[PDB]
Amino acid sequence: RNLSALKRHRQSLKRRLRNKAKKSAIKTLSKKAIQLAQEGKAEEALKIMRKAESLIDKAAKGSTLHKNAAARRKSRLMRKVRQLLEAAGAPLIGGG
Amino acid sequence: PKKVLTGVVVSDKMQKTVTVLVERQFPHPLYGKVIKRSKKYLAHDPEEKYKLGDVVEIIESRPISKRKRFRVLRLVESGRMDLVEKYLIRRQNYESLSK
Amino acid sequence: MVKIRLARFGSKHNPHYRIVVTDARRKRDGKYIEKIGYYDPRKTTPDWLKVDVERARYWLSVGAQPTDTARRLLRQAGVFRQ
Amino acid sequence: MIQPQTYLEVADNTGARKIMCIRVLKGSNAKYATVGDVIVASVKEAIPRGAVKEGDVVKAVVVRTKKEIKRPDGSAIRFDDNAAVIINNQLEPRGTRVFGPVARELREKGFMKIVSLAPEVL
RNA sequence: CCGAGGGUAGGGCCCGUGACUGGGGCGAAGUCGUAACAAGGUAGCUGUACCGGAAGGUGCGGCUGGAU
RNA sequence: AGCGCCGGCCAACUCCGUGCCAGCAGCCGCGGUAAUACGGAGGGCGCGAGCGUUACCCGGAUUCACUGGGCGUAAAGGGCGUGUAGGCGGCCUGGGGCGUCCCAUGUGAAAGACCACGGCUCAACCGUGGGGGAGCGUGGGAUACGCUCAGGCUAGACGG
RNA sequence: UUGGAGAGUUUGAUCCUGGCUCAGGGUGAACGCUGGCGGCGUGCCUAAGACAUGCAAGUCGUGCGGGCCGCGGGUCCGUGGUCAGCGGCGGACGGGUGAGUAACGCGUGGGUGACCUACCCGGAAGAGGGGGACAACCCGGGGAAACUCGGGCUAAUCCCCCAUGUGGACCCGCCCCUUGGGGUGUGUCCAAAGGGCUUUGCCCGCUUCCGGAUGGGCCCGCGUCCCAUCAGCUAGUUGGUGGGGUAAUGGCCCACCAAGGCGACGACGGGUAGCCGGUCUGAGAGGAUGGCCGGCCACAGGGGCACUGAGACACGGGCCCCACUCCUACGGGAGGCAGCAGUUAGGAAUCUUCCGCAAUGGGCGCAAGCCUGACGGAGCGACGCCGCUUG
RNA sequence: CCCUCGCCAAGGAACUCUGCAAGUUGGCCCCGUAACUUCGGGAGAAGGGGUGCUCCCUGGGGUGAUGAGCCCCGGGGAGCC
Ligand SMILES: [Mg+2]
Ligand SMILES: [Mg+2]
Ligand SMILES: [Mg+2]
Ligand SMILES: [Mg+2]
Ligand SMILES: [Mg+2]
Ligand SMILES: [Mg+2]
Ligand SMILES: [Mg+2]
Ligand SMILES: [Mg+2]
Ligand SMILES: [Mg+2]
Ligand SMILES: [Mg+2]
Ligand SMILES: [Mg+2]
Ligand SMILES: [Mg+2]
Ligand SMILES: [Mg+2]
Ligand SMILES: [Mg+2]
Ligand SMILES: [Mg+2]
Ligand SMILES: [Mg+2]
Ligand SMILES: [Mg+2]
Ligand SMILES: [Mg+2]
Ligand SMILES: [Mg+2]
Ligand SMILES: [Mg+2]
Ligand SMILES: [Mg+2]
Ligand SMILES: [Mg+2]
Ligand SMILES: [Mg+2]
Ligand SMILES: [Mg+2]
Ligand SMILES: [Mg+2]
Ligand SMILES: [Mg+2]
Ligand SMILES: [Mg+2]
Ligand SMILES: [Mg+2]
Ligand SMILES: [Mg+2]
Ligand SMILES: [Mg+2]
Ligand SMILES: [Mg+2]
Ligand SMILES: [Mg+2]
Ligand SMILES: [Mg+2]
Ligand SMILES: [Mg+2]
Ligand SMILES: [Mg+2]
Ligand SMILES: [Mg+2]
Ligand SMILES: [Mg+2]
Ligand SMILES: [Mg+2]
Ligand SMILES: [Mg+2]
Ligand SMILES: [Mg+2]
Ligand SMILES: [Mg+2]
Ligand SMILES: [Mg+2]
Ligand SMILES: [Mg+2]
Ligand SMILES: [Mg+2]
Ligand SMILES: [Mg+2]
Ligand SMILES: [Mg+2]
Ligand SMILES: [Mg+2]
Ligand SMILES: [Mg+2]
Ligand SMILES: [Mg+2]
Ligand SMILES: [Mg+2]
Ligand SMILES: [Mg+2]
Ligand SMILES: [Mg+2]
Ligand SMILES: [Mg+2]
Ligand SMILES: [Mg+2]
Ligand SMILES: [Mg+2]
Ligand SMILES: [Mg+2]
Ligand SMILES: [Mg+2]
Ligand SMILES: [Mg+2]
Ligand SMILES: [Mg+2]
Ligand SMILES: [Mg+2]
Ligand SMILES: [Mg+2]
Ligand SMILES: [Mg+2]
Ligand SMILES: [Mg+2]
Ligand SMILES: [Mg+2]
Ligand SMILES: [Mg+2]
Ligand SMILES: [Mg+2]
Ligand SMILES: [Mg+2]
Ligand SMILES: [Mg+2]
Ligand SMILES: [Mg+2]
Ligand SMILES: [Mg+2]
Ligand SMILES: [Mg+2]
Ligand SMILES: [Mg+2]
Ligand SMILES: [Mg+2]
Ligand SMILES: [Mg+2]
Ligand SMILES: [Mg+2]
Ligand SMILES: [Mg+2]
Numbered sequence A: 001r002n003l004s005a006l007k008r009h010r011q012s013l014k015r016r017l018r019n020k021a022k023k024s025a026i027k028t029l030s031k032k033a034i035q036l037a038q039e040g041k042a043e044e045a046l047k048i049m050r051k052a053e054s055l056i057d058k059a060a061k062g063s064t065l066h067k068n069a070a071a072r073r074k075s076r077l078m079r080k081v082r083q084l085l086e087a088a089g090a091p092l093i094g095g096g
Numbered sequence B: 001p002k003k004v005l006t007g008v009v010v011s012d013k014m015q016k017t018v019t020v021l022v023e024r025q026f027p028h029p030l031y032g033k034v035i036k037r038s039k040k041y042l043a044h045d046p047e048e049k050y051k052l053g054d055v056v057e058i059i060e061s062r063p064i065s066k067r068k069r070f071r072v073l074r075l076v077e078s079g080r081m082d083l084v085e086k087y088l089i090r091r092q093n094y095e096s097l098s099k
Numbered sequence C: 001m002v003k004i005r006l007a008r009f010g011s012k013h014n015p016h017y018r019i020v021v022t023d024a025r026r027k028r029d030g031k032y033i034e035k036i037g038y039y040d041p042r043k044t045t046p047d048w049l050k051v052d053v054e055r056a057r058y059w060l061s062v063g064a065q066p067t068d069t070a071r072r073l074l075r076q077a078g079v080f081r082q
Numbered sequence D: 001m002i003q004p005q006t007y008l009e010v011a012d013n014t015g016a017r018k019i020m021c022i023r024v025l026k027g028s029n030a031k032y033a034t035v036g037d038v039i040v041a042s043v044k045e046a047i048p049r050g051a052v053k054e055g056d057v058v059k060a061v062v063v064r065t066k067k068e069i070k071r072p073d074g075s076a077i078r079f080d081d082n083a084a085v086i087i088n089n090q091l092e093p094r095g096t097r098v099f100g101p102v103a104r105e106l107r108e109k110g111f112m113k114i115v116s117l118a119p120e121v122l
Numbered sequence E: 001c002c003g004a005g006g007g008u009a010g011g012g013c014c015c016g017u018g019a020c021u022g023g024g025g026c027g028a029a030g031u032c033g034u035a036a037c038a039a040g041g042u043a044g045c046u047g048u049a050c051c052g053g054a055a056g057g058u059g060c061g062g063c064u065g066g067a068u
Numbered sequence F: 001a002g003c004g005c006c007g008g009c010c011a012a013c014u015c016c017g018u019g020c021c022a023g024c025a026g027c028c029g030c031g032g033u034a035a036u037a038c039g040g041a042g043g044g045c046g047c048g049a050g051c052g053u054u055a056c057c058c059g060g061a062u063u064c065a066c067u068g069g070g071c072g073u074a075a076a077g078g079g080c081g082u083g084u085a086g087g088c089g090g091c092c093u094g095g096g097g098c099g100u101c102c103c104a105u106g107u108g109a110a111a112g113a114c115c116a117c118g119g120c121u122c123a124a125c126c127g128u129g130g131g132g133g134a135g136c137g138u139g140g141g142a143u144a145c146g147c148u149c150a151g152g153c154u155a156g157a158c159g160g
Numbered sequence G: 001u002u003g004g005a006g007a008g009u010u011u012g013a014u015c016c017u018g019g020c021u022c023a024g025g026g027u028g029a030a031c032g033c034u035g036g037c038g039g040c041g042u043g044c045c046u047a048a049g050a051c052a053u054g055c056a057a058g059u060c061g062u063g064c065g066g067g068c069c070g071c072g073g074g075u076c077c078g079u080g081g082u083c084a085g086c087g088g089c090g091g092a093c094g095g096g097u098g099a100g101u102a103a104c105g106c107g108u109g110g111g112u113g114a115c116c117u118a119c120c121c122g123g124a125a126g127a128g129g130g131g132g133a134c135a136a137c138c139c140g141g142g143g144a145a146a147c148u149c150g151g152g153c154u155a156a157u158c159c160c161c162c163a164u165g166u167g168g169a170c171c172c173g174c175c176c177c178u179u180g181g182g183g184u185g186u187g188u189c190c191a192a193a194g195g196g197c198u199u200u201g202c203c204c205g206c207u208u209c210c211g212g213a214u215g216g217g218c219c220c221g222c223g224u225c226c227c228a229u230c231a232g233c234u235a236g237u238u239g240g241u242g243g244g245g246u247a248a249u250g251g252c253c254c255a256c257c258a259a260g261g262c263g264a265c266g267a268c269g270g271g272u273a274g275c276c277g278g279u280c281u282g283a284g285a286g287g288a289u290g291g292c293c294g295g296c297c298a299c300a301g302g303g304g305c306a307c308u309g310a311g312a313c314a315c316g317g318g319c320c321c322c323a324c325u326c327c328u329a330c331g332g333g334a335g336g337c338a339g340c341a342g343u344u345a346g347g348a349a350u351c352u353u354c355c356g357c358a359a360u361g362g363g364c365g366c367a368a369g370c371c372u373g374a375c376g377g378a379g380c381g382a383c384g385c386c387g388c389u390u391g
Numbered sequence H: 001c002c003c004u005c006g007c008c009a010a011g012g013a014a015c016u017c018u019g020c021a022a023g024u025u026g027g028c029c030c031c032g033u034a035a036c037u038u039c040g041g042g043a044g045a046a047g048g049g050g051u052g053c054u055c056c057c058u059g060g061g062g063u064g065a066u067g068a069g070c071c072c073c074g075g076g077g078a079g080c081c
C-alpha cells in the first residue's frame, strides 16, 4: 500500500503554495499600477509597474511562469499603462 | 506552400468577411467521368473591398476565427453575378425539396 | 535524448539486431529515426556486423548517445579511430 | 407517527424509492409507527430493475421520522423526513447499503445490521 | 460565475410486452362450391363502384394478353 | 492410425437387414419386400496426426455489371406535358493552360509482399541486398481533345 | 500482357430468362471421432462484468541533516551498513485495452511571420555577498487500524534578497523584412549550487543566451460506412471591435455590435465502426476485413476537476460526486488487474498464481550497481503453418 | 351547545354516496407549452422564472416651440432590507 509517489504529492502541494503566492502578487501589482495609470498619477504608476515587471520576470526564472507568459504579461502591462497616461500624460519616471 | 484557391464571392453580409465559393473537377474514382464538387470558404477581408460577384483567389492562412482560416489573396475578376445566380437559384430551389 | 542502439529482430534463440538511431523513449523494436547497420551476435555469416560509419558519426556529432554494447560495435567498426 | 397512507422515503438500495404504509405491525390495532417499528407497505415508486418493484407489498422498519422522538434523558431528535429500510421476515435489510442517518433507537430494537451500515447514528 | 450530478415538469425516438383482434405463410388426410386455364361452358383481364357464404357478380369506362 | 466419402454434381459397388418405417439430405432427391441413395458388412475412393462438421469472409455471381448486365412479350419506360438544378452539346480562328499528357525532384517509415542470395541438417521461421508503384507537394514543358475567355460562321435551333 | 474452367435443379422434350445449391481459398476459431514427435508462430473475438494474493517504478551518500546495529580506537571521532526524512532525476516512457469517437480521429500532402521541447550535442559567457522556512529529530494530545493534531529544534543542489549583465524579456522610435521574421538606440526587468577527488588542477553538477537534434501543439487541401420511411438545421449560432487565456492561432472563454453560418455536392437526425501500414480473396477491377507486428488516436470502475511539471488534466499521483464491494474494536476506514499470472461470471471458446535480468532496451547513478511481469526464455493447448515417425 | 371566523404536531382523503365542505391556485411581466383538430383552436394547456426600495447611466412619445417644466412607455448598471 505505499510509495514515494506520496513524497511526490507532498512536494507538489508545497510548490503549489509558492506558485499561487507568486501569481497573486503579480496580478495585485499590475492591477495596482494599471489602476494608477488610469487616474495617472504618472510617477506612481510607473513606479509600481517596475515592481510588477520585476516580480513577473522573477517568477519566469522558475516553473511558475513560462518565460513567454512573462513576456506576454509584461507586454500587456506596458501597453495598458502608457495608453492610459495618453489620456493626460506625461511620463514622470522610467520606463520606457 | 500555402494552398491557394480561386472562387466567387457569394456573400458579403458579414462584416470583414466574404464567403468564397471554390469549385473543382476530378475523375470519379470508379465511374471515370469528370465530376464537379464545390465548397464555401469564409475569407478574411479586413478592408471590406471585395464585393459580391468578385472572382478572387484566397490563400490558406493562420486562423482568424472559427471557420475562417483563409485571407483573400487578391482580386481576379469583377462582376460575375451570373455565378452568384447559379448558387442562389440552387439555394432558392431548396424550398421545393421539403415536406 | 536521441539514441543509437540495437533493435532485436530475427526470432527465438536466433537474434539479429539492427544498429539503429531511435528516440530513447521509443519501444525497442519501434519506429526508428533511421537504420544505420546491423549485428549478428551468433556471428553466423561472413559479415555478422556492418555499420554506415559516415552516418553514425553524424548522429554522434549532433548528440546521439550510443548504448554500451553499441559503443563497442561502433569501436569494432572503428567509428572511434582518431 | 407513520400511519396507513403515509409515504416514506426508503433509505436503502433495494431500488424502492417511495413506499406507502399500509399497516403498522405493532399489535392488534396500533395507530402509529415510530422509529424501530415495522410496517407493511406498498411500493409506490421504485427505479428500474431493483430487488423491488412498484406494486410490491413489503415490510420495512422505520428508521427516521419527521415527528420528533423523545428520549429518557430529556432530549429529543427529529429528522427532515420519514424513512424506512426494507427488511425481510428476520429483520435483515433486503438491501446492502443504507443512506442517511438513523435513529439510535434501532439498535436497542435489534436492527444492528441496519444500524451498522448507516453512515451516522443520532 | 461556471460547474459533476441531483430534483421537478413537459416533450421526441427506439425496444420489449398486452386482453383482444386483422389478415399472411404452411400443413393436410376435411366441408362447400367451380372463379381462371378450351369460346373453360356468361371471352378474359382491368380502374372504380355497389353487392354477395365463398371463389365471385353486376354497372361504367378501358385493353386484347379473345376463340368462332 | 485415424476420419470423411462411394446415387448425380464427385474419385470410389456388392451382400444382408429394413419395407413411405427406421432413417439420409448441401441442391436434385432417396425409402411403399431385389435400395449402388437408409443401417451394418466386405470391398473401394480421398486425405493422414490428422479427418470432418458448424459459423463467417471473398470466390464461382457478367446475380449491382467501372472492367462487365439489362427494361415489346421474361423483373424492368415515369399516364402525358411543361420546365428548375444538373448532365451533356455544331463548324472556323486566336489568347489562357483548369482537366489531360511528359520530364525532373521531394514524399511515398519499418515490417509484410515480389525477385536474388544466405542462416537454422530442410522447411516453417528468420537475415542481407534488389526492384518499383499509385497518390500528393514542387520546378519545368506540351496544346490535340474537354475547359475558359475573345472573334468569326450557318448545316442545329428560333423567327419573317 | 505468367492471367480468367464450371456443375446440379423450372420442361414430355427445347431454347431463354432467373433464383437457389455445390465443388475453391481463408480464420484469434469452435464442435465431433482420433491423436505419436519437434520447430516457429499463436491463444477471452463474449461482461470496457466483478475480482482473493503476490508481483508489474524506481534510483542517487559524488546534493543534506539525523536514527538504529556494527567496525575501526580516545565521551569523542572516523568507516561501513540499514531506515525513514529533506533534495534531485524518473514516475507523461515502457505495458494493457478498443469502451467512446463518422471526427482534422485517422490517412495522405502541406502550413506555423502563431508555437513548445527535460535529459543529449555544438558554440558564447558565468558562479561575488547576505538571510530564512520545513521535515527527520525531542515534547505533549487522538485511535483497533488508516493514521493524524499541536509545541519546539536543525542541514542542504530547498526558499529568498542584493550584487554582477555576455546575453535574454518588455514598451516607444527607426531600417531591412512582410501576419508576431531579423537588427538597432533610449528606459525598465531577470541568473546561479555546489559536491568530489589524486586538492593553484581535473571530474560530475549549477546559471543565462544562441544554434542544433529529437519528441510534440495548433492550422489547412483531399480521402474515410448504412438509413432521405432523418429535409431542413443553427443564439456562442456566423462575422466583427475590445479584452481574458495559452507555448501558440482561434467563439477556446467573456462584454458589446452586426445578422449572419450550414444544407439534396445531403446539413440536422438516427444506426454501426477506433483509423492506417497491412490482411484475406479475386484474372484483374473489385469485395471483405483491421486479431498478432508497426504507426497514430482514445480510454484507465462511471463522471467532473485541476495541482505538480519540459511534458499530464496523469492506469499502478491528487480532489470531489455516483455505483459496488470490503475491513473493523461498530467509533470509524479502505479499494479500482483494459499491467503479468491467477479467481469468478458470461460463453461454442481462449493459457503458467513458471524462470531470469544472461541477452536487447529503459530509469536513476562518477561508478560499483539497483529496479525492470518491458523483455529474454520455459509451461499448457494439433489453434495454425513447416518438418519427422509408426519402418 | 349553535352560528360565522382564525390557527394547529405527525399524517394527508385513511373522511364520505361524493374531496361534500375547506385548503391549494390566484394579478401583471417574461420564458415555455402535448395528444388531438373542423387548423380557429385545444391555451391562462402543463410547468417555471420575475415582482420592493435606493443611486448612476440611458431610449422613444404627448404638451410646449425644436427647449424648459409637466405627463406617458421603456432599457442597462450597481446596490439596500
Ligand atoms: Mg523519491
Ligand atoms: Mg487581492
Ligand atoms: Mg506550471
Ligand atoms: Mg520558464
Ligand atoms: Mg478574430
Ligand atoms: Mg404497474
Ligand atoms: Mg446545469
Ligand atoms: Mg442536468
Ligand atoms: Mg449529487
Ligand atoms: Mg391470430
Ligand atoms: Mg367469369
Ligand atoms: Mg368455369
Ligand atoms: Mg367463363
Ligand atoms: Mg368491374
Ligand atoms: Mg349465406
Ligand atoms: Mg348482383
Ligand atoms: Mg384507353
Ligand atoms: Mg470428403
Ligand atoms: Mg471433390
Ligand atoms: Mg464416379
Ligand atoms: Mg425398422
Ligand atoms: Mg434389400
Ligand atoms: Mg450419398
Ligand atoms: Mg449404403
Ligand atoms: Mg503434417
Ligand atoms: Mg457467397
Ligand atoms: Mg469456377
Ligand atoms: Mg462481382
Ligand atoms: Mg456497364
Ligand atoms: Mg440480366
Ligand atoms: Mg409511355
Ligand atoms: Mg402519377
Ligand atoms: Mg440548363
Ligand atoms: Mg458545359
Ligand atoms: Mg465544341
Ligand atoms: Mg494544365
Ligand atoms: Mg512518384
Ligand atoms: Mg516498404
Ligand atoms: Mg508489384
Ligand atoms: Mg539454405
Ligand atoms: Mg527484406
Ligand atoms: Mg489553343
Ligand atoms: Mg462563339
Ligand atoms: Mg437550318
Ligand atoms: Mg425438380
Ligand atoms: Mg413453367
Ligand atoms: Mg423432371
Ligand atoms: Mg442456373
Ligand atoms: Mg477437436
Ligand atoms: Mg480427447
Ligand atoms: Mg510453443
Ligand atoms: Mg476484450
Ligand atoms: Mg451485466
Ligand atoms: Mg458480477
Ligand atoms: Mg520484484
Ligand atoms: Mg552527483
Ligand atoms: Mg547498498
Ligand atoms: Mg534514502
Ligand atoms: Mg503507452
Ligand atoms: Mg504484447
Ligand atoms: Mg474502439
Ligand atoms: Mg452520427
Ligand atoms: Mg476532414
Ligand atoms: Mg490532414
Ligand atoms: Mg521534469
Ligand atoms: Mg541555517
Ligand atoms: Mg535583481
Ligand atoms: Mg454574447
Ligand atoms: Mg482577439
Ligand atoms: Mg499548459
Ligand atoms: Mg463555440
Ligand atoms: Mg459540398
Ligand atoms: Mg444520400
Ligand atoms: Mg450509440
Ligand atoms: Mg465500439
Ligand atoms: Mg471475378
Ligand SMILES: [Mg+2]
Binding pocket: G290
Ligand atoms: Mg473494421
Ligand SMILES: [Mg+2]
Binding pocket: G045, G291
Ligand atoms: Mg477480429
Ligand SMILES: [Mg+2]
Binding pocket: none
Ligand atoms: Mg495494433
Ligand SMILES: [Mg+2]
Binding pocket: none
Ligand atoms: Mg471517461
Ligand SMILES: [Mg+2]
Binding pocket: none
Ligand atoms: Mg476515470
Ligand SMILES: [Mg+2]
Binding pocket: G301
Ligand atoms: Mg473494469
Ligand SMILES: [Mg+2]
Binding pocket: none
Ligand atoms: Mg475514478
Ligand SMILES: [Mg+2]
Binding pocket: G314, G317
Ligand atoms: Mg501516473
Ligand SMILES: [Mg+2]
Binding pocket: G314
Ligand atoms: Mg487519476
Ligand SMILES: [Mg+2]
Binding pocket: none
Ligand atoms: Mg488522458
Ligand SMILES: [Mg+2]
Binding pocket: none
Ligand atoms: Mg502510460
Ligand SMILES: [Mg+2]
Binding pocket: G315, G316, G337
Ligand atoms: Mg491498475
Ligand SMILES: [Mg+2]
Binding pocket: G144, G329, G331
Ligand atoms: Mg474503537
Ligand SMILES: [Mg+2]
Binding pocket: none
Ligand atoms: Mg477520512
Ligand SMILES: [Mg+2]
Binding pocket: none
Ligand atoms: Mg488488490
Ligand SMILES: [Mg+2]
Binding pocket: none
Ligand atoms: Mg487468465
